PDB file of C-alpha atoms in Angstrom:
ATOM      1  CA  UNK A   1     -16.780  46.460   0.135  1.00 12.82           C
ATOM      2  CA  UNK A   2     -17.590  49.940   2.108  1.00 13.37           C
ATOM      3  CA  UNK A   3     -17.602  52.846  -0.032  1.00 13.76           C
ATOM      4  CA  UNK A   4     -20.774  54.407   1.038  1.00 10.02           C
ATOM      5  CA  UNK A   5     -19.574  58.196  -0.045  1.00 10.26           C
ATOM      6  CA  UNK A   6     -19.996  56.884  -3.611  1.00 12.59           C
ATOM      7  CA  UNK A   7     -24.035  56.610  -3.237  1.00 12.24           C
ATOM      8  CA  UNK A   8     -24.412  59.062  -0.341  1.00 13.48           C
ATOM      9  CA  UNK A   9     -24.961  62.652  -0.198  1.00 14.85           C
ATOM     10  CA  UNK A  10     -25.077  64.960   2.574  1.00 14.40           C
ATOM     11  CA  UNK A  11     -22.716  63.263   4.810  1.00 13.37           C
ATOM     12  CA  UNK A  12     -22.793  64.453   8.658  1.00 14.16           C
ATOM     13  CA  UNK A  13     -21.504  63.837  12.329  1.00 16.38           C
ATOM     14  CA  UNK A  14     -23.186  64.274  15.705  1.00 15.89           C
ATOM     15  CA  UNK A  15     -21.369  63.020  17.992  1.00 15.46           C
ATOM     16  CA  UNK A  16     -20.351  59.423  17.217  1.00 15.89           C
ATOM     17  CA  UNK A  17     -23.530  59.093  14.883  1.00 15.20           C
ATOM     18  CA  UNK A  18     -22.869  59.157  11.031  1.00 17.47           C
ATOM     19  CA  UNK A  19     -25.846  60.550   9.356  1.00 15.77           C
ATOM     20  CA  UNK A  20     -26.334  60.279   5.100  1.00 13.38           C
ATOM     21  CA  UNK A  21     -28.787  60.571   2.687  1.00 10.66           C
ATOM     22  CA  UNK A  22     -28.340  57.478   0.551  1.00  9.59           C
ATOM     23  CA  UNK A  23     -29.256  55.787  -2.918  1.00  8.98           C
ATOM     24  CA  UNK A  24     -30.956  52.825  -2.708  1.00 10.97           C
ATOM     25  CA  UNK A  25     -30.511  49.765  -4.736  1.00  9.75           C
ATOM     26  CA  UNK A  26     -32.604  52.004  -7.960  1.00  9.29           C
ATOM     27  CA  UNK A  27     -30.000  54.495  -7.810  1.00  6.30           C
ATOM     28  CA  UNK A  28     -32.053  56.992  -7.001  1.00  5.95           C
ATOM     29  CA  UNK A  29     -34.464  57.387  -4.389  1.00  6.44           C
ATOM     30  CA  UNK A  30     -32.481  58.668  -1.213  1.00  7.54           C
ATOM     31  CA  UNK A  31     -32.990  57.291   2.455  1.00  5.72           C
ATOM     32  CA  UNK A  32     -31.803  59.025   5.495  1.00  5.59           C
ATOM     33  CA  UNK A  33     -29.376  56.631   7.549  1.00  4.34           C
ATOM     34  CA  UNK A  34     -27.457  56.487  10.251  1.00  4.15           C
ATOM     35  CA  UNK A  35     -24.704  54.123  12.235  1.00  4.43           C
ATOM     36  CA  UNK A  36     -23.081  54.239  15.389  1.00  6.34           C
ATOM     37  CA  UNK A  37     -19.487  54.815  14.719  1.00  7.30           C
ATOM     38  CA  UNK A  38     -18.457  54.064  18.358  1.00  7.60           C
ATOM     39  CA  UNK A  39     -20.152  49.996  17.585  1.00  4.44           C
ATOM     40  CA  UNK A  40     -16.933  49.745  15.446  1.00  7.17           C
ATOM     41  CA  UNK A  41     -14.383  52.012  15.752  1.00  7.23           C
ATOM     42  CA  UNK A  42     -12.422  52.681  19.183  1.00  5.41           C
ATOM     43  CA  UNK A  43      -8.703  54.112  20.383  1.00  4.68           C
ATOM     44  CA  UNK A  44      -5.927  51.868  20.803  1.00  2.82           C
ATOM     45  CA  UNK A  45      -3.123  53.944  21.949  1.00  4.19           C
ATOM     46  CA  UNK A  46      -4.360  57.056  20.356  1.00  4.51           C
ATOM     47  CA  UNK A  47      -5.173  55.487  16.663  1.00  2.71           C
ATOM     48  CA  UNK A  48      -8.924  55.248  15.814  1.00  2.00           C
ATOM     49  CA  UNK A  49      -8.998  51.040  14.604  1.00  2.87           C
ATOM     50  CA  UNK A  50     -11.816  49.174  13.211  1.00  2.00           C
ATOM     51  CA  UNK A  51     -13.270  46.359  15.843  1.00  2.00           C
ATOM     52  CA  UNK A  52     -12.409  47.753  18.693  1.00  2.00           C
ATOM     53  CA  UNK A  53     -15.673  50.383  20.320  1.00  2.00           C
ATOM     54  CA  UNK A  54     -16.384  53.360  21.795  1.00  2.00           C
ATOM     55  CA  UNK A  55     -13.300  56.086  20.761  1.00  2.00           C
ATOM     56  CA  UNK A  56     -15.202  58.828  22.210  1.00  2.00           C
ATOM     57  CA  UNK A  57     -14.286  57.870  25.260  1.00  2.00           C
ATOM     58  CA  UNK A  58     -11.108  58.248  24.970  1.00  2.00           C
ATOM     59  CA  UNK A  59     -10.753  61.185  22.127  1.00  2.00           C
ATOM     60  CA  UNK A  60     -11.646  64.923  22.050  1.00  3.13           C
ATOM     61  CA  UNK A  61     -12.359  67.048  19.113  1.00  5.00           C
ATOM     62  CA  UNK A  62     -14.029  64.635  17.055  1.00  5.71           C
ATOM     63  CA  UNK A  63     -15.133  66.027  12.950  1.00  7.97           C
ATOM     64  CA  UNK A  64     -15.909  64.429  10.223  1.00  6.44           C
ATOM     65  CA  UNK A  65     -13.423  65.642   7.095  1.00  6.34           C
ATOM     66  CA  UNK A  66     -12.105  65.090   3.886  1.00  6.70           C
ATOM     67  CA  UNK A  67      -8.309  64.230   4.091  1.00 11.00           C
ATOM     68  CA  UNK A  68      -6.189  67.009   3.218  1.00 10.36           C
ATOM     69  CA  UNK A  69      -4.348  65.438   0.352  1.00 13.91           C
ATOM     70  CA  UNK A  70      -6.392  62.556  -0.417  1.00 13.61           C
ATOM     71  CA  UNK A  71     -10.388  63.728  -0.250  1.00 12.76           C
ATOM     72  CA  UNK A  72     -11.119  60.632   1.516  1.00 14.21           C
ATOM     73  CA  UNK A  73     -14.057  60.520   4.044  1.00 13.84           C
ATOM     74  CA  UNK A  74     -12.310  60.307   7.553  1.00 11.01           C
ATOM     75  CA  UNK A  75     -13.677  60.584  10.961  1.00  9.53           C
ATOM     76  CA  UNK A  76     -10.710  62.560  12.698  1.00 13.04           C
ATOM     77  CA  UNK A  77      -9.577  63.035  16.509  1.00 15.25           C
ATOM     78  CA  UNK A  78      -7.378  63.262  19.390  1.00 16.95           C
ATOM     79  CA  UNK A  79      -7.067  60.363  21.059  1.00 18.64           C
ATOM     80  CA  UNK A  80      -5.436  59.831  24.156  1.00 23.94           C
ATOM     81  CA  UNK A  81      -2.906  57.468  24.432  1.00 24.31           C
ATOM     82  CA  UNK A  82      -2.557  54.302  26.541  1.00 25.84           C
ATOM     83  CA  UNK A  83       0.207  56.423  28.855  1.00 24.79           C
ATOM     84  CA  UNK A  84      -3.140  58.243  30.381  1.00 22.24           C
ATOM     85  CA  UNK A  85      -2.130  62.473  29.208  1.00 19.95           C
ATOM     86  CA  UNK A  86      -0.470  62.074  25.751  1.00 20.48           C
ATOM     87  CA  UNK A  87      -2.768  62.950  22.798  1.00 20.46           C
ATOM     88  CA  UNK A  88      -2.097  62.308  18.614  1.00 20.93           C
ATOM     89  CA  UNK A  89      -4.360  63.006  16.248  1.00 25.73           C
ATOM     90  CA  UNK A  90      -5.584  60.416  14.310  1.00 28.26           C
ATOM     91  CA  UNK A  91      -7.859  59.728  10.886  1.00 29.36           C
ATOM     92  CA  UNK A  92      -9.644  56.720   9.874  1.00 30.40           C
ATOM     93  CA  UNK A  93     -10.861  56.409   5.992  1.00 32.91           C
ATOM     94  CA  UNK A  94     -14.872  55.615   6.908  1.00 29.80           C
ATOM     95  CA  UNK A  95     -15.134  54.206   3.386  1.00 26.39           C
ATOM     96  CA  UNK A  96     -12.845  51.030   4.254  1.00 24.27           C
ATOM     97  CA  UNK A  97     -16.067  49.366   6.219  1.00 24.97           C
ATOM     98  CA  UNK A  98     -19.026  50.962   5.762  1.00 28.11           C
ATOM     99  CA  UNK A  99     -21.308  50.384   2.680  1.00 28.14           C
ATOM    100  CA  UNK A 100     -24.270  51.563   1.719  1.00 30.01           C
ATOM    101  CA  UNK A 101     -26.427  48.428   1.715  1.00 30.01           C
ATOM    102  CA  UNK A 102     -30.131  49.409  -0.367  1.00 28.42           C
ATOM    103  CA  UNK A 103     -30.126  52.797   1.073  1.00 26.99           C
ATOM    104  CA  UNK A 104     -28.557  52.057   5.031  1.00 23.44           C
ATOM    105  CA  UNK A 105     -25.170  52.568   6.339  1.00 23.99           C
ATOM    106  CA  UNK A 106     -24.008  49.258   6.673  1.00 25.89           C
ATOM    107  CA  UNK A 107     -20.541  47.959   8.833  1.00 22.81           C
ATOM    108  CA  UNK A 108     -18.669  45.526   5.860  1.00 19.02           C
TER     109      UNK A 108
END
């Protein structure tokens, strides 16, 4: 499941949006998708966690990146934790639930 960087080029952020190009199911004619990463992703006590929503809310300086050691696709912040004025940074691989279903971003 997920794995979308393997068949998607061009990868972007704007905002909470997560924009691609993407192969569909031919392997080669490219679609431009994109999915709502606050639908799926929020802060609980400053780590960005799958099934919870809307991180931005609670998280500044939001990128898209390629970790340091690892080259995995990770949406990256600092999210406030639950005490109210503590902030941590925080990573979460985007490739662990979201595929690229025929050409569209796709939560898996």
């Amino acid at each position: 499941t997920g794995q979308f960087s393997k068949t998607c080029e061009d990868i972007t952020l704007d905002g909470s949006t997560l924009s691609a190009f993407c192969q569909k199911a031919d392997g080669y004619t490219l679609n431009e998708t994109s999915i709502n990463l606050d639908e799926e992703i929020g802060n609980l006590d400053g780590t960005l966690s799958w099934g919870d929503h809307n991180f931005s809310l609670t998280c500044d300086s939001i990128g898209l990146a390629q970790s340091l050691f690892t080259r995995t696709y990770v949406l990256a912040a600092e999210c406030e934790r639950r005490d109210g004025y503590t902030y941590i940074p925080t990573e979460i691989e985007l490739d662990e639930h979201i595929a690229n279903i025929d050409g569209t971003l796709t939560y898996e």
